[PDB]
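ok so heres the complex, two chains, lmk if somethin looks off
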Amino acid sequence: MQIFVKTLTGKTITLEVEPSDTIENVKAKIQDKEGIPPDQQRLIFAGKQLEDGRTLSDYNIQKESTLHLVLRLRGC
Amino acid sequence: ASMRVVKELEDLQKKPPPYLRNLSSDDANVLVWHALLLPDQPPYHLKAFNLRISFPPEYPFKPPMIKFTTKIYHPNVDENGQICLPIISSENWKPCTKTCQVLEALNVLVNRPNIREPLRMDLADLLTQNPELFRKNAEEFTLRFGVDRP
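and the predicted structre for the whole thing:
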């Protein structure tokens, strides 16, 4: 299913993931096209943080769901 | 603690770099430095940017937090005025390092943008696509929310 990943920069990308897709794998898919390291990838959905070991079924994520990607810059 | 800060300031106030002017302590704080950064890179060379150096009470064991007082349209600076300098980060810091060295690193990063690890993916992408368009936006901003060139 096609979901929408929107960064804090407004940049929204389309991602193809299945309900059984793990969040950690989702991060990899994002880095695959964008390049943002998973360590700095903080996916927020409906106010809840997506745990790496969780899947899209856990948080009940449907198609076209817009996720908010917060970048964790580790350089301060 | 503040003893070293006073020394560093006293030294820098005698032989200040060509890119650092109006360097003095805060009106009511010796642990706060006030200075105007003069970038040479275009179009930041049209104006100056004021920076505020905040020295921690655990100096020099704790790195001095430097932030921008003014607004600089740079892909390595945030909309508020925060920066990510590895030299004074919680991931890397040496008490033997003086503020003068940090100022140099800051100046280098302000002049030469880092498209590898930036603070603004939008500006970084733009810079690596159209330098002219980026220059236009940065220019108007510099001559809008920037301090006059000393």
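quick notes: Chain B touches chain A through 13 residues (CB under 8 Å). thats all i got rn
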